[PDB]
CSV table of C-alpha atoms in Angstrom, one decimal:
chain,number,residue,atom,x,y,z
A,1,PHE,CA,134.4,54.1,123.8
A,2,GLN,CA,137.7,54.2,125.6
A,3,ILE,CA,137.7,57.8,126.8
A,4,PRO,CA,141.2,59.3,127.1
A,5,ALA,CA,142.8,59.7,130.5
A,6,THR,CA,143.1,63.4,130.0
A,7,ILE,CA,139.3,63.7,129.9
A,8,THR,CA,138.3,61.3,132.6
A,9,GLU,CA,140.8,62.8,135.0
A,10,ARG,CA,139.2,66.2,135.0
A,11,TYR,CA,135.7,65.3,133.8
A,12,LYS,CA,133.3,62.6,135.1
A,13,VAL,CA,131.6,61.3,131.9
A,14,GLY,CA,128.1,59.8,132.5
A,15,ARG,CA,125.1,58.6,130.5
A,16,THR,CA,124.6,59.2,126.8
A,17,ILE,CA,122.3,62.2,126.6
A,18,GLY,CA,122.0,62.5,122.8
A,19,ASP,CA,123.0,60.6,119.6
A,20,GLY,CA,123.5,61.4,116.0
A,21,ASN,CA,124.6,59.9,112.6
A,22,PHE,CA,128.2,61.2,113.2
A,23,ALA,CA,128.2,62.2,116.9
A,24,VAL,CA,127.4,60.9,120.3
A,25,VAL,CA,126.7,63.2,123.3
A,26,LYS,CA,127.3,62.2,127.0
A,27,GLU,CA,127.1,63.7,130.4
A,28,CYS,CA,130.3,65.5,131.4
A,29,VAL,CA,130.7,67.1,134.8
A,30,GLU,CA,134.0,69.0,135.5
A,31,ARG,CA,135.3,67.4,138.7
A,32,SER,CA,137.0,70.5,140.0
A,33,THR,CA,134.0,72.9,139.5
A,34,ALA,CA,131.1,70.4,139.3
A,35,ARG,CA,130.0,72.4,136.3
A,36,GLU,CA,127.9,70.4,133.8
A,37,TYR,CA,129.1,70.2,130.2
A,38,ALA,CA,128.4,68.0,127.1
A,39,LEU,CA,131.0,65.5,125.8
A,40,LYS,CA,130.6,65.4,122.0
A,41,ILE,CA,132.3,62.3,120.6
A,42,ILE,CA,132.8,62.1,116.8
A,43,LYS,CA,133.9,58.7,115.3
A,44,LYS,CA,136.7,59.6,112.8
A,45,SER,CA,135.8,56.6,110.7
A,46,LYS,CA,132.6,58.3,109.6
A,47,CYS,CA,134.2,61.7,108.8
A,48,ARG,CA,137.0,60.4,106.6
A,49,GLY,CA,137.0,61.9,103.1
A,50,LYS,CA,135.1,64.9,104.5
A,51,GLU,CA,137.5,65.9,107.3
A,52,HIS,CA,137.4,69.6,106.2
A,53,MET,CA,133.7,70.0,107.0
A,54,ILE,CA,134.2,68.9,110.6
A,55,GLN,CA,137.6,70.6,110.9
A,56,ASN,CA,136.3,73.9,109.6
A,57,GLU,CA,133.5,73.9,112.1
A,58,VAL,CA,135.9,73.1,115.0
A,59,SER,CA,138.4,75.7,114.0
A,60,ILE,CA,135.6,78.3,114.1
A,61,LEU,CA,134.4,77.1,117.5
A,62,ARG,CA,138.0,77.3,118.6
A,63,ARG,CA,138.2,81.0,117.8
A,64,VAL,CA,134.8,82.3,118.8
A,65,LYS,CA,134.6,83.5,122.4
A,66,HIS,CA,131.4,85.3,123.2
A,67,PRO,CA,128.8,85.0,126.0
A,68,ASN,CA,125.9,84.8,123.6
A,69,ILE,CA,127.3,81.7,121.8
A,70,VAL,CA,127.4,78.0,122.7
A,71,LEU,CA,131.1,77.7,123.3
A,72,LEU,CA,133.7,75.0,122.8
A,73,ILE,CA,135.3,74.5,126.2
A,74,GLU,CA,138.0,71.9,125.2
A,75,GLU,CA,138.9,69.5,122.5
A,76,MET,CA,140.8,66.2,122.9
A,77,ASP,CA,141.9,64.7,119.6
A,78,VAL,CA,142.8,61.0,119.3
A,79,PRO,CA,143.4,58.7,116.3
A,80,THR,CA,140.0,57.1,116.4
A,81,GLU,CA,137.7,59.8,117.7
A,82,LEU,CA,137.4,63.6,118.2
A,83,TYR,CA,136.3,64.7,121.7
A,84,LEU,CA,134.6,68.1,122.1
A,85,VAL,CA,133.6,69.5,125.5
A,86,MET,CA,130.6,71.8,124.7
A,87,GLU,CA,128.4,74.1,126.7
A,88,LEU,CA,125.2,72.4,127.8
A,89,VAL,CA,122.5,75.1,127.8
A,90,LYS,CA,119.3,73.8,129.5
A,91,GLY,CA,117.0,76.8,129.6
A,92,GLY,CA,115.2,75.6,126.4
A,93,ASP,CA,115.1,77.4,123.1
A,94,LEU,CA,113.8,80.7,121.9
A,95,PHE,CA,110.2,79.6,121.8
A,96,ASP,CA,110.5,78.5,125.4
A,97,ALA,CA,112.0,81.9,126.2
A,98,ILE,CA,108.7,83.5,125.1
A,99,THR,CA,106.4,80.9,126.6
A,100,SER,CA,108.1,80.5,130.0
A,101,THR,CA,108.2,84.3,130.2
A,102,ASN,CA,105.3,85.7,132.1
A,103,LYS,CA,104.7,89.4,131.8
A,104,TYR,CA,106.3,89.1,128.3
A,105,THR,CA,106.8,92.6,126.8
A,106,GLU,CA,108.7,94.4,124.1
A,107,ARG,CA,111.6,94.9,126.5
A,108,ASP,CA,112.0,91.1,126.6
A,109,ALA,CA,112.0,90.7,122.9
A,110,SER,CA,114.5,93.7,122.5
A,111,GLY,CA,116.7,92.0,125.1
A,112,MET,CA,116.8,88.8,123.2
A,113,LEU,CA,117.6,90.6,119.9
A,114,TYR,CA,120.4,92.4,121.7
A,115,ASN,CA,122.0,89.0,122.6
A,116,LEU,CA,121.4,87.8,119.1
A,117,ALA,CA,122.7,90.9,117.3
A,118,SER,CA,125.7,91.1,119.7
A,119,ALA,CA,126.6,87.5,118.7
A,120,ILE,CA,126.2,88.2,115.0
A,121,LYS,CA,128.2,91.4,115.3
A,122,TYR,CA,131.1,89.3,116.9
A,123,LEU,CA,130.9,86.7,114.2
A,124,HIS,CA,130.8,89.2,111.4
A,125,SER,CA,133.8,91.0,112.8
A,126,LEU,CA,135.7,87.7,112.3
A,127,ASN,CA,134.0,87.4,108.8
A,128,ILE,CA,132.0,84.4,109.9
A,129,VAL,CA,128.5,83.8,108.6
A,130,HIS,CA,126.3,81.4,110.6
A,131,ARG,CA,123.8,80.6,107.9
A,132,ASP,CA,121.5,78.7,110.3
A,133,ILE,CA,120.2,81.3,112.7
A,134,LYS,CA,116.8,80.1,113.8
A,135,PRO,CA,114.8,79.7,117.1
A,136,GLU,CA,115.9,76.1,117.5
A,137,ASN,CA,119.5,77.2,117.5
A,138,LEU,CA,119.0,79.9,120.2
A,139,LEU,CA,119.2,78.3,123.7
A,140,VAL,CA,118.3,80.1,126.9
A,141,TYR,CA,120.9,80.7,129.6
A,142,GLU,CA,119.2,81.4,133.0
A,143,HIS,CA,121.1,83.7,135.4
A,144,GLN,CA,120.9,83.6,139.2
A,145,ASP,CA,118.7,86.7,139.4
A,146,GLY,CA,116.1,85.1,137.0
A,147,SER,CA,117.2,87.1,134.0
A,148,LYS,CA,117.9,85.3,130.7
A,149,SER,CA,120.5,85.4,127.9
A,150,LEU,CA,120.4,83.7,124.5
A,151,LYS,CA,123.3,81.6,123.2
A,152,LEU,CA,123.7,80.9,119.5
A,153,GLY,CA,124.6,77.3,118.7
A,154,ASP,CA,124.9,74.8,115.8
A,155,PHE,CA,127.8,76.2,113.7
A,156,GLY,CA,127.3,73.3,111.2
A,157,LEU,CA,126.8,75.7,108.3
A,158,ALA,CA,129.2,78.4,109.6
A,159,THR,CA,132.0,79.5,107.3
A,160,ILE,CA,134.5,82.2,106.6
A,161,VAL,CA,133.4,84.6,103.9
A,162,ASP,CA,136.1,85.5,101.4
A,163,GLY,CA,133.6,86.3,98.7
A,164,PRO,CA,130.0,85.7,97.6
A,165,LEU,CA,128.6,82.4,98.6
A,166,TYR,CA,126.2,80.5,96.3
A,167,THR,CA,125.3,77.2,98.1
A,168,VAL,CA,121.6,77.2,98.9
A,169,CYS,CA,121.7,76.4,102.6
A,170,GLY,CA,119.3,77.2,105.4
A,171,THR,CA,115.7,76.8,106.6
A,172,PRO,CA,113.2,78.2,104.0
A,173,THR,CA,111.4,80.4,106.6
A,174,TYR,CA,114.6,82.2,107.6
A,175,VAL,CA,116.5,82.1,104.3
A,176,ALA,CA,117.4,85.4,102.7
A,177,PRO,CA,116.3,86.4,99.2
A,178,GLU,CA,119.8,86.5,97.7
A,179,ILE,CA,120.3,82.9,98.8
A,180,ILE,CA,117.1,81.8,97.0
A,181,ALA,CA,118.1,83.8,93.9
A,182,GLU,CA,121.6,82.3,93.9
A,183,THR,CA,123.0,85.7,93.0
A,184,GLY,CA,125.7,85.7,95.7
A,185,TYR,CA,125.3,86.2,99.4
A,186,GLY,CA,127.5,87.0,102.4
A,187,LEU,CA,127.3,88.0,106.1
A,188,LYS,CA,124.0,89.9,106.0
A,189,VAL,CA,121.9,86.8,105.5
A,190,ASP,CA,122.3,86.4,109.3
A,191,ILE,CA,120.6,89.8,109.6
A,192,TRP,CA,117.7,88.7,107.5
A,193,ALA,CA,117.3,85.6,109.6
A,194,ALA,CA,117.5,87.7,112.8
A,195,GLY,CA,114.9,90.0,111.2
A,196,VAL,CA,112.5,87.1,110.7
A,197,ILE,CA,113.1,86.1,114.3
A,198,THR,CA,112.4,89.6,115.6
A,199,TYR,CA,109.1,89.6,113.7
A,200,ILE,CA,108.2,86.3,115.4
A,201,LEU,CA,109.2,87.8,118.8
A,202,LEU,CA,106.5,90.5,118.5
A,203,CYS,CA,103.6,88.6,117.1
A,204,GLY,CA,104.4,84.8,117.2
A,205,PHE,CA,104.3,84.0,113.5
A,206,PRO,CA,106.6,84.5,110.5
A,207,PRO,CA,106.4,87.5,108.1
A,208,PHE,CA,106.6,85.2,105.1
A,209,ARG,CA,104.4,82.1,105.3
A,210,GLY,CA,103.1,81.8,101.8
A,211,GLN,CA,106.5,76.2,99.0
A,212,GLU,CA,107.1,78.3,95.9
A,213,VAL,CA,104.7,81.0,97.2
A,214,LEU,CA,106.9,81.3,100.3
A,215,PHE,CA,110.0,81.8,98.1
A,216,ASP,CA,108.2,84.5,96.1
A,217,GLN,CA,107.2,86.3,99.3
A,218,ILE,CA,110.9,86.3,100.5
A,219,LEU,CA,112.2,87.5,97.1
A,220,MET,CA,109.8,90.4,97.1
A,221,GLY,CA,110.5,91.2,100.8
A,222,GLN,CA,107.2,92.9,101.4
A,223,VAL,CA,106.7,92.9,105.2
A,224,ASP,CA,103.1,93.2,106.4
A,225,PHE,CA,102.2,94.1,109.9
A,226,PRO,CA,98.6,92.9,109.9
A,227,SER,CA,96.0,94.0,112.4
A,228,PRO,CA,95.3,93.7,115.2
A,229,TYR,CA,98.5,91.9,116.1
A,230,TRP,CA,100.8,94.9,115.3
A,231,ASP,CA,98.5,97.7,116.4
A,232,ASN,CA,100.0,98.1,119.9
A,233,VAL,CA,103.5,97.3,118.7
A,234,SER,CA,105.9,100.3,118.6
A,235,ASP,CA,106.6,101.9,115.2
A,236,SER,CA,110.3,101.9,116.1
A,237,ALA,CA,110.1,98.1,116.3
A,238,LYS,CA,108.3,97.8,113.0
A,239,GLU,CA,110.8,100.3,111.5
A,240,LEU,CA,113.7,98.1,112.7
A,241,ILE,CA,112.4,94.9,111.2
A,242,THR,CA,111.8,96.7,107.9
A,243,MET,CA,115.5,97.6,107.7
A,244,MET,CA,116.5,94.1,108.6
A,245,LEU,CA,114.4,92.6,105.9
A,246,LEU,CA,115.4,94.7,102.9
A,247,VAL,CA,116.0,92.8,99.7
A,248,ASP,CA,118.7,95.4,98.8
A,249,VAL,CA,121.7,94.0,100.8
A,250,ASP,CA,123.6,97.4,101.0
A,251,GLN,CA,120.5,99.1,102.3
A,252,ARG,CA,119.9,96.2,104.8
A,253,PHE,CA,121.2,96.9,108.3
A,254,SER,CA,124.5,95.4,109.5
A,255,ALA,CA,124.8,93.9,113.0
A,256,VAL,CA,126.1,97.2,114.3
A,257,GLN,CA,123.3,99.2,112.7
A,258,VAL,CA,120.8,96.9,114.4
A,259,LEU,CA,122.4,97.3,117.8
A,260,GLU,CA,122.6,101.1,117.2
A,261,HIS,CA,118.9,101.3,116.4
A,262,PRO,CA,116.9,103.1,119.2
A,263,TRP,CA,114.6,100.1,119.8
A,264,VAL,CA,117.7,98.1,120.6
A,265,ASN,CA,120.2,100.7,121.7
A,266,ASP,CA,117.9,102.7,124.1
A,267,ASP,CA,116.5,100.3,126.7
A,268,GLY,CA,113.7,102.8,127.5
A,269,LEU,CA,111.9,102.7,124.1
A,270,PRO,CA,110.7,99.1,124.2
A,271,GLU,CA,107.3,98.9,125.8
A,272,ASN,CA,107.4,97.1,129.2
A,273,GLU,CA,103.9,97.9,130.6
A,274,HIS,CA,101.6,96.4,128.1
A,275,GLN,CA,102.2,92.7,127.4
A,276,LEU,CA,102.4,90.8,124.1
A,277,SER,CA,99.9,88.0,123.6
A,278,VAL,CA,102.3,85.9,121.5
A,279,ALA,CA,102.2,82.5,123.2
A,280,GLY,CA,99.0,81.4,121.3
A,281,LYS,CA,100.5,82.0,117.9
A,282,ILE,CA,103.8,80.1,118.6
A,283,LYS,CA,102.1,76.8,119.3
A,284,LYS,CA,99.9,77.2,116.2
A,285,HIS,CA,102.8,77.8,113.8
A,286,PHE,CA,105.9,76.3,115.4
A,287,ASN,CA,106.9,73.1,117.2
A,288,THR,CA,107.9,72.8,120.9
A,289,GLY,CA,111.3,71.5,121.7
A,290,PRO,CA,112.4,69.7,124.9
A,291,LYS,CA,111.1,71.1,128.2
A,292,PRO,CA,113.6,73.5,130.0
A,293,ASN,CA,116.1,71.6,132.2
A,294,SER,CA,114.9,68.3,130.8
A,295,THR,CA,117.3,65.6,129.9
A,296,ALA,CA,117.2,66.3,126.1
A,297,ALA,CA,117.3,70.1,126.4
A,298,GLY,CA,119.9,71.9,124.3
A,299,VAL,CA,121.4,68.5,123.3
A,300,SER,CA,120.2,68.6,119.7
A,301,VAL,CA,122.4,71.6,119.0
A,302,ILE,CA,125.4,69.6,120.2
A,303,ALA,CA,124.3,66.2,118.7
A,304,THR,CA,124.3,67.6,115.2
A,305,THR,CA,127.4,68.2,112.9
A,306,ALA,CA,128.2,69.8,109.6
A,307,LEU,CA,127.7,66.4,107.9
A,308,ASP,CA,124.1,66.3,109.1
A,309,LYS,CA,123.3,69.3,107.0
A,310,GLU,CA,121.3,69.1,103.8
A,311,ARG,CA,119.7,71.5,101.2
A,312,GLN,CA,116.0,72.2,101.9
A,313,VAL,CA,115.3,75.1,99.4
A,314,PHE,CA,114.2,74.1,95.9
A,315,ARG,CA,112.5,76.5,93.6
A,316,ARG,CA,110.5,75.4,90.6
A,317,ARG,CA,113.3,75.5,88.0
A,318,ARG,CA,112.9,78.5,85.7
């Protein structure tokens, strides 16, 4: 790679941190600020014929400015490659945000859902559906006071909604019913995914576990709060998740209605005295990504592109 002068003059590019089928990720420290970013290099020879899938992702990243999102800092376009300076979030993913968190309570989970719901609200205001909201795409941004804020990344499936979508995209665990049914879906699939995540935040395992049995569970949308894991969980929290996981799209909460819900709106409702023994269930059901502040932390989100995306949901044909 012959990095353009414009980049190397203001950024000191270092080692290759990550790699992909269509993208390479390198170290990238801004010289003036000494702030650490990620230099995403896309070989244009690989994206030919499918320019739109890359270009549509970038044009979205170009527009979205929100603290709870992995932002595109700068882009340098040359005939042979596309350069993208991306935010390098090193605090680990959502599962690490639970594990690393001692004295983990309902206030912590509610705080994370606020960051998530806020980001979704911002996207939906621009008529952008993410379609890939999952713990692996929620990186942790650690502040100087020790507090944490989530940042939604991987816009490889993101798209503008002009009407009902029908492409069966997404991870089976977090996919909404209307996607599975192929009856037409829109923005509120992000709410469903966020609802699945919220359920995991409070007990450490998905609401729908069941492959075909899983799809049937999602389609029916019957949320169970089994004992004793949900006994000491607030009813307001269980009420919220119920409204986020409604099969009826119109009844299902919007991003606003989630943020306006007491358990999210009022920062006094969430329990902060009694902890949530969730760490045990996370390891049992989910994988563990790169260690926080490791070399490969938050790199996977940047290493991937829209061309790396594939269908995963396959019902037994009716």
